[PDB]
Amino acid sequence: SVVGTPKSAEQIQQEWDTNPRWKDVTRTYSAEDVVALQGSVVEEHTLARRGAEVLWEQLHDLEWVNALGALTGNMAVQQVRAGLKAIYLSGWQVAGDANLSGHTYPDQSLYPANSVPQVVRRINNALQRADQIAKIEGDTSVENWLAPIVADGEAGFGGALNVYELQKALIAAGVAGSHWEDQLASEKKCGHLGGKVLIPTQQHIRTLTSARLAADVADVPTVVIARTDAEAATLITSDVDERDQPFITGERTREGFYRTKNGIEPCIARAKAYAPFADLIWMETGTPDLEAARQFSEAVKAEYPDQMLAYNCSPSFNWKKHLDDATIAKFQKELAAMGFKFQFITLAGFHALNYSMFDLAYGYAQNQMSAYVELQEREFAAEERGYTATKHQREVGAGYFDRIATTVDPNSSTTAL
Amino acid sequence: SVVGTPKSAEQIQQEWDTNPRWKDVTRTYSAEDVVALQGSVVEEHTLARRGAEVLWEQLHDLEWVNALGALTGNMAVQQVRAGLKAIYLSGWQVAGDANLSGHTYPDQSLYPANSVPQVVRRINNALQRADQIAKIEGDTSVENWLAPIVADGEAGFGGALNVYELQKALIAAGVAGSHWEDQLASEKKCGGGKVLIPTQQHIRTLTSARLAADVADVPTVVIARTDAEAATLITSDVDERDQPFITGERTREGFYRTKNGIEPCIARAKAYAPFADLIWMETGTPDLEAARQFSEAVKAEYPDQMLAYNCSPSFNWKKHLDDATIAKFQKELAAMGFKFQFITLAGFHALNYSMFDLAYGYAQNQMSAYVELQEREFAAEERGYTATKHQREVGAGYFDRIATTVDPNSSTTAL
Amino acid sequence: SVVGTPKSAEQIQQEWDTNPRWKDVTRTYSAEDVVALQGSVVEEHTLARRGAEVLWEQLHDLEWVNALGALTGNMAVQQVRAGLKAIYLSGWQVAGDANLSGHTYPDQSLYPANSVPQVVRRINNALQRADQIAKIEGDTSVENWLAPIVADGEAGFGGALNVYELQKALIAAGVAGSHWEDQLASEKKCGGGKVLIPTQQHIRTLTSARLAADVADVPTVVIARTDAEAATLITSDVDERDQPFITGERTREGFYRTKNGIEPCIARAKAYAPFADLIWMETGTPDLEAARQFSEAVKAEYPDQMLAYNCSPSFNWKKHLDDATIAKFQKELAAMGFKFQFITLAGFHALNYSMFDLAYGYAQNQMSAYVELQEREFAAEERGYTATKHQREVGAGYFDRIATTVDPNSSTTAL
Amino acid sequence: SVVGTPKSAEQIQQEWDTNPRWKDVTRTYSAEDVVALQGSVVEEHTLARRGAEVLWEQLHDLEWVNALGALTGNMAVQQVRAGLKAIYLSGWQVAGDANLSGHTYPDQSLYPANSVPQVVRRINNALQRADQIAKIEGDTSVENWLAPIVADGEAGFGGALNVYELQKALIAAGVAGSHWEDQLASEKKCGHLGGKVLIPTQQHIRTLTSARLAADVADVPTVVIARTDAEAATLITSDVDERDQPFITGERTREGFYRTKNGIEPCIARAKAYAPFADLIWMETGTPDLEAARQFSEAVKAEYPDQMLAYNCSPSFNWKKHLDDATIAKFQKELAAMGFKFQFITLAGFHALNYSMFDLAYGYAQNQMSAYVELQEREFAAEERGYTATKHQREVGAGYFDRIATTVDPNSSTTAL
Ligand SMILES: C=C(CC(=O)O)C(=O)O
Ligand SMILES: C=C(CC(=O)O)C(=O)O
Ligand SMILES: [Mg+2]
Ligand SMILES: [Mg+2]
Ligand SMILES: [Mg+2]
Ligand SMILES: [Mg+2]
């Protein structure tokens, strides 16, 4: 058998040289380095490849791509049924309510490192079932059930090899893109002079290089997002990288961390340093602020006018205390005009799930079935916008499995499609 | 070490004889049979014991115990924060969106048999974190975070040993009660209907589940479910109790056609009563008259037998009922002896609907839709909702306190 | 994007019609039935396809394909390093020491149904790491590290849909072949014997497994196993092919007593042949005459039908056979058409014995026992053993090369 | 219900004050700090408590406790049947052939952090089945099937909270003791001036404190082992701790690591610093050397004469090239005389499994059944020393489950025990 024969270094190099996908993508390693790590057989990763291709297309065709955080398969199925074209997989949400430890965790890289890959695979499985059901029912209402997944890679749960293995695991599960941040969450100092701890610029370039190499060895054009936490971070592990030295204050704490001046300047500097190694750049920010977004946007594009940006819209910001309805209403459109082509709400699923269950359960504790009928009536109404989960058996594939059982029975006949 | 030394057959026997918990509980096996299966060390199962005890207490003190299906830890945390005293763990919901295969399945015992135990363990982990947070914050608003969990056991994923291992795994995870049904879902004929198993086989199932609870040394609550209302087929006519409803026709698989309805459900419920702490007649449409007839027929032989009731999540409740009937439904049922009531698919509907509504709003208006949800969350704070404070909701202050305890240059707040 | 576009019903049909792989393969369903179950995108399964292709090739080129049971990744790596061309994945061994419950189980389909797929995936991961290491080291001593895997499918853990999902999960993990048996282990009567299912039900199982392979678009090798040599009971007399052996007596569970032996195994094998790439008569004692009689009876109707043979790990081989018979056993069987042969429990015995012998030596003499094992490992290097270089065996040089690739101040060795 | 009611701070403090177990055990946190983290209900951890108690007993009664690395449940069952009184759970072996990623990994904290806890739970399950079988068969030949498990905790997969969560997960699975090392494996530099990277002394005291606190909050007297990697390590993350400064050379690498003088001196210094926080101390060493063992032994006991030590006997050292048979034969007895009360071979299971399968498979590839009969004959012979796995069905519990099935059947009767 010749199934899965690797490409040659020449073919790979030629694709890096000629495919517009790799315009302005720096790989400090060689095509031979990639082939040297592939063994004799390269597994195809169908969903990871299709998702990365679809995601790149969409980022260049649509006015922007927006997404909500999904932590279960059904959540993602509903996001797609409602008309979204991408799925965001929050590591925060996974820590909170969907990781392999079984525990509720805060957002400090506490959960087992293969947790997000498992949820990626779950989400793709759920979308695949929605697509199977759609096909056997002649449902053409959704063009692409297999929406690309953008997954939270945290800072990789360790060093370069941890980064590599996480990216490989995300790719195997069918991820379309992954984001990677330049902090050490496990040493977040929670005292009064504490805060987030950055790692040196060169180390995050190491992380982004590792992630790209895992994609190359897996032979898929995964979308790579660099996140910088330098807006708020007050500490950094080391001053060894001279690009970081302009912000070093000269103080070192009792734990050995270096105090560093934070804000938009180091975020601009780090984004420029990361741009050659990142398909998109993301400045984590506490306050939604169109002006600060524009300033970061323009500083980065002054050196890299084609560099695409990513934007998280803060779920904890008190939006309506601080912005009027019109600013809220135009926020994403403005950001998209500035180059933020991927935008998302990290904790959408957490809030929807916790709120809907609290509201239903509170009603239920006081009035039993009357609360449930309020929810059921809203579901019935929602049928008008395309909601289908009111037909619960069919939603989870009962018709699909009946068809399988009928296919297998030689005395029952299947309906022609 | 003496940790975990088993009891004697004598102590076990005396507890079966004198503890009011075991009035009306038949064990066809012996206390020696139990001790023989325990080895040299018996692991303590704190959460399974405490949950089963609280569940029994509540079933005898409150007017009724009700619950909503939970498929995530946060879901159960919110149900308890909102004032519920029990959690229902739907295997249907687990098939749909929370099982170890990673796949979306319909309700036919397709998922790996240890999936529900994992979700039990997750739910307990989440309630324990809520309890930890409440303690360090002086929050007394909820008196018992560790609400008892009642879990779906399907028909055990096989034979008596499969039942035994599932009950053992549910107990290990900290389950308080488990329900067990008398159908073979993996042979549901689809041309058809559900296929029952003989009455004696389900008595075997209930005996297996009680034996696993005994060997684990916890007073787990056992719920027997009968699917005889709707089931049209049965695997065999070997049981004389099943023969009155056998028509005599056999399908191409060898299954026997059987008259379904409330009559075989009353018969099977009476057969199951000695082996079940609660009895549940699965029904498709909510029907107070059918519930009353089943209740009364069963209590005519076992006036103390407690019953359980699923309130249909798919029934178009209102299309068919006025607001007052809907509002009194559970109270009427409770008066009939239905002391555990639940909505199996509450979580599935809350999750799917809330995400569809948010996502549709978002696709059309971006941040304005999220702001609608956020404002509703703010409003809900007035009723005790706390998840707007998201970091604290998932334990950020708790883990900060651990970090402060471990740091010798920081001092911990005294409680 | 066009990635993963399904084939047409027409292409599938033509491949079933013209590819020699599907000579003598009956599909009672249609190509349209297959396309209807594929959705819009078909995931490629590289390892399942390559393994199934290599396995079919080898079964037609070599005198016979033999294998040992592997329950860990390293076990399979050593089997291939030693020169074997296939891996056997024992579900018995998985029950005993490698299943997702964490428990030690006997051989009664007690473990979670996705456990064997996980071990398939693990074994492939381990072979892939060995292949990676060999490449960066210029090691050509092994031509194919990715030996095809044949996995135990039990009886599917339920009905047709359970079979379907198990085959799908085995393919997803990269399995090359899977075997499926016609008993209900979860009802093994223990007073007793194995309980068969009707012939038509196992044809349903094999059809389910072929359908799952088709929908996944891989030419998985399907092995049908019959337990009719020893089984004394059967669930139903509904199948006319089973009736000649029914005695007419029924047990208290409703099972029918049936004459066991080679005769019902020949009958069932002939019934299964159109739906099976290989046929396997489970047998307790190795018996060349019984193997010859079964082989010849089956090939009288299907002269091209390939057979599979488990060589008993519990038989006291030698107490009963001279050295020359033992030495020729597999070659004789191969001459009879047994083209896949294996020892189910090779790994269980190698693991348990090597650890008992080492640990006993250690308990009595501490380091001297370990030094005995280490010296034997050194000696084995002469035959190609490499695990004495332990860091390199588990990938230390490979991950060093990744670290060197990622570091822009270090240069990588050219291959 | 009152099941699982927590103890008061007073009871806890009184046990720390009066129980000889806690003689010379420093806790820098308070009993109130412990109670503050326990919520309203404390789960009992039966096997973790019994294993920690049995392990402490054995460490004080026997001349020493020795162990072999086990990576499957059957391996541990065989170690106990052969007469060992403890089980060692190698994280190396778990990386190599038994972790939740499914992948073969080298020993660099690459696998998901809950992997060892899963194997602990597996090993206890396997021993529990052996004990059940023994009881129903009247097998009294083994006194304690539930041998204590000592598990590899690596350096905790991150910071203090990662350490805490791993220790809690090990305790929940029934671990008896856990060991913790002072290196950052994920930044091991593999170049020519590379090597292992130490963390500051104060940080490892933080790790050991965290591990003790997780045990206290879980209410079990888990055995805590500190390992130092300073014999060979050439780098350290920071020079901020003045106890480390004597060995700092003054050079810092391009990655920001500090070059540090290695050997037995920093191992003695670190062991002394760790002793108040560790039930046993372990100097990782490359060469088995009774003299170096004695020197480390005596330096530590000069300040802490009662401090127990732990010793790994190197599986890669070429024992018979470098030591005569008599030294090999007396090695553990000598070490025990010097205070090494827990001794183990980390990779015993890896070598036994890989070698036995290679030997069998090589024989099999050339001669089919003749190779298997050689193995079977050795098993038959081994029956004489108590080996039972030749009876394969009974070994994995077939008799136990037949008894369960017979217990459940009201028309079959059980055998009286
Ligand atoms: C809440 C989050 C989650 C995260 O850190 O990924 C944010 O606002 O970015
Ligand atoms: C091989 C090992 C494994 C380990 O690092 O724990 C050693 O010798 O210590
Ligand atoms: Mg995160
Ligand atoms: Mg169900
Ligand atoms: Mg088997
Ligand atoms: Mg290790």
Residue numbers in the entry:
A (entry chain B), D (entry chain B): 2 to 418
B (entry chain A), C (entry chain A): 2 to 192, 195 to 418
What did the authors write?
Isocitrate lyases (ICLs; isoforms 1 and 2) catalyze the reversible conversion of isocitrate to glyoxylate and succinate in the glyoxylate cycle, which is used to bypass the two decarboxylation steps of the tricarboxylic acid (TCA) cycle. Owing to the crucial function of ICLs for the survival of M. tuberculosis in the host, they have been considered major therapeutic targets for the treatment of tuberculosis. Although it has been shown that itaconate produced by a host directly inhibits an ICL from M. tuberculosis (tbICL) to protect against the infection, the molecular mechanism of ICL inhibition by itaconate remains elusive.
Among the crystals prepared using various combinations of substrates and itaconate, the structure of tbICL in complex with succinate and itaconate was determined at 2.58 Å resolution. In our structure, succinate (a substrate/product of tbICL) and itaconate (an inhibitor of tbICL) were bound to the active sites of chains A and B, respectively. Thus, although each subunit contains a different molecule in the active site, this distribution of heterogeneous molecules in the two subunits did not cause significant structural differences. In the active site of subunit A, two carboxylic acid groups of succinate are coordinated to adjacent water molecules, by which interactions with residues such as Ser91, Trp93, Asp108, Asp153, Glu182, Arg228, Glu285, Asn313, and Thr347 are mediated. However, itaconate directly interacts electrostatically with proximal residues, such as Arg228 and Asn313, whereas succinate does so only with Arg228. In addition, while succinate directly binds to five water molecules, itaconate directly interacts with only three water molecules. These differences suggest that itaconate is relatively less dependent on water molecules for binding to the active site than succinate is. However, we found that the positions of the L5 loop (residues 189–197) and the C-terminal tail are different, depending on the conformer. Moreover, our structure corresponds to the same open form as that observed in the native form, although subunit B has the inhibitor itaconate in the active site.
